[PDB]
Amino acid sequence: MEWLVKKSCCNKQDNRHVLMLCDAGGAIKMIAEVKSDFAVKVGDLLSPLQNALYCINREKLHTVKVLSASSYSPDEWERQCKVAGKTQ
Template identity: 40%
Template structure:
């Protein structure tokens, strides 16, 4: 689960990616829910679901996903 910032819009998203996403990485939209990681054409990911950010929901997800290694906060 990622947090995406786009201006005043803040979203939580699940993604499919072959690449590890690190805190501080920036996602750049290209087309049809596809994003580049740090503008690297060879590192693409797909948004599989997204919802408006909720601090309560985010805390709940963090607690339930403690064993999941791919959690990051992404700004862009």
């Protein structure tokens, strides 16, 4: 099972990014809060490496670490986007 970043929320302020994880085609959509050692943006594939680590874009060298995830809802997405930026 591999996923597609359909939306992404850049940060510095607590390193925690948030992105909409979706089906590899967009047919199903979710949200995840993650930490990242590299940039990640819309159109990137994600593929698992272990329970929490996933590749970025399509290559194993670049990684995120999942922290939480949920089914998509608009208020629940924007909530996590706020947490990515110290709740503003």
